[PDB]
Design a protein around this nucleic acid. Structure first.
Ligand SMILES: [Zn+2]
Ligand SMILES: [Zn+2]
Ligand SMILES: [Zn+2]
Ligand SMILES: [Zn+2]
Lengths: 71, 74
DNA sequence: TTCCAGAACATGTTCTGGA
DNA sequence: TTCCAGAACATGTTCTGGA
């Protein structure tokens, strides 16, 4: 039911983890190309359905921590 | 200024002649320029607001034109 | 039947040049 | 000082091949 990365509604098991579509799409883009990833506030950003956009670097670390994997 | 003329989200300015949010501004540009084939899946009278503007891009674009938006404007 | 990765499709946010 | 168009950047959602 809940996305392990942002607590939004999970659509299913993506890349090894239960996530929503946004996190599924964000993760793949994160590992492939990227998007500026180095936090300012510094690794303590609250990643939820409403503030996930606020910090791209914290979102990804949480994707990794959650154990999402392409391979 | 105040609310978006199209969806009522907070407007960021006058874009293409009308007071719109940034989402509606980018949406209008794509509606006029891209290859689309819009037709309301319902009765062509959907309520377009912040949480629902994604539900029917056909009526959203109709609202944009209605409200006077036009690529030939500031 | 039921599932998901990725492509295809759709949407939203920041930046700032040249007024 | 302030404004916006569009480029560049960033994000989210549908669809379905091939299991
Ligand atoms: Zn998520
Ligand atoms: Zn952060
Ligand atoms: Zn709007
Ligand atoms: Zn409609």
């Amino acid at each position: 039911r809940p996305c392990l990365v942002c607590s939004d509604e999970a659509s299913g098991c993506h890349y090894g983890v239960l996530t929503c579509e946004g996190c599924k799409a964000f993760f793949k883009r994160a590992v492939e190309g990227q998007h500026n990833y180095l936090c300012k506030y510094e690794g303590k950003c609250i990643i939820d359905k409403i503030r996930r956009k606020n910090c791209p670097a914290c979102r990804y670390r949480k994707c990794l921590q959650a154990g999402m994997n392409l391979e």
